[PDB]
Structure formats: C-alpha cells, structure tokens
Amino acid sequence: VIRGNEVSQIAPGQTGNIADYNYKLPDDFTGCVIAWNSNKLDSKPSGNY
Amino acid sequence: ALGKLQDVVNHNAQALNTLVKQLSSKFGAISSVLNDILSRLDPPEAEVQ
C-alpha cells in the first residue's frame, strides 16, 4: 500500500523515497503493475497509521 | 615531387582525426559525454541515450 502520488514511482528507473528505500524495481523488469484506490478499506477517520 | 607518399600519410592521419572527432558528436542525443548521460539520467532513458 502506497500514497496516491507514489504510483508513478512503482516503475523501473524511477527515483522515489519508497523506490530507493522501500521497494526497488530492476531496470529490465517485465510484468504488470496494478494500482487501485483503497479509501473504503484502508482508511479510518481518526487516521489509519 | 613526393606528393603521392605524403598524400597517403595525410589520408591516414586525417582518417584517424575524423574518427577521434566523431567522439564529439551528440548523434541525436542530449550530450556527447557518456559520464554526463549516466550522471544526469536514470537507466531506462540513459540506455536510450
């Protein structure tokens, strides 16, 4: 699970804080990236931490 | 009198000079320096350059 703006960072060759320190993709990566909104299940009014 | 031999020497030097000169050609890329391309760009676009 990541932020809305960080979906671009889940790609080969992207510089992102999550890209450098959390999940790294190889340059020659083959496969598919799937991103969908999870506001209904992965959010809380008080703050889901 | 000795133009023919000198011409051959000239051609060889000129050919080498041209080949060396060709290293300074962008060839449709942002820069002619490989180190600059690696330093400034990520591998997916650096590979293209």
Q: Do the chains contact at A27 and B45, CB–CB below 8 Å?
A: no
Judge: B43–A27 Cβ closer than 8 Å, yes or no.
yes
Q: Find, among B26, B38, B27, the residue nearest to A13 by Cα.
A: B38
Chain A positions touching B42 (Cβ under 8 A) are: 13-15
The structure tokens listed for A27 are 């340059």
Q: Reduce the DSSP state of residue B1 to 3 states and report it.
A: coil
- Reading phi first (left if > 0) and then psi (alpha if -120 to 50, else beta), residue B32 is in alpha
Distance CA A30, CA B7 (A): 55
The contacts of residue B23 (CB under 8 Å, 6+ apart) are B32
For A39, the token pair is 């506001």
Largest CA distance in chain B: 58
Burial class (CB in 10 A: 0-12, 13-18, 19+), B41: middle
Question: To which H or E segment does residue B25 belong?
Answer: none
Q: Which of A37, A27, A26, A31 is CA-nearest to residue A2?
A: A37
Residue to substitute from A10, A27, A29, A30, interface B, most B β-carbons within 10 A? A27
Q: What is the DSSP letter of B12?
A: H
Contacts of A14 in chain B (CB under 8 A): 42
DSSP string, A1-41: ---STTTTTSSTT---HHHHHT----TT--S-------HHH
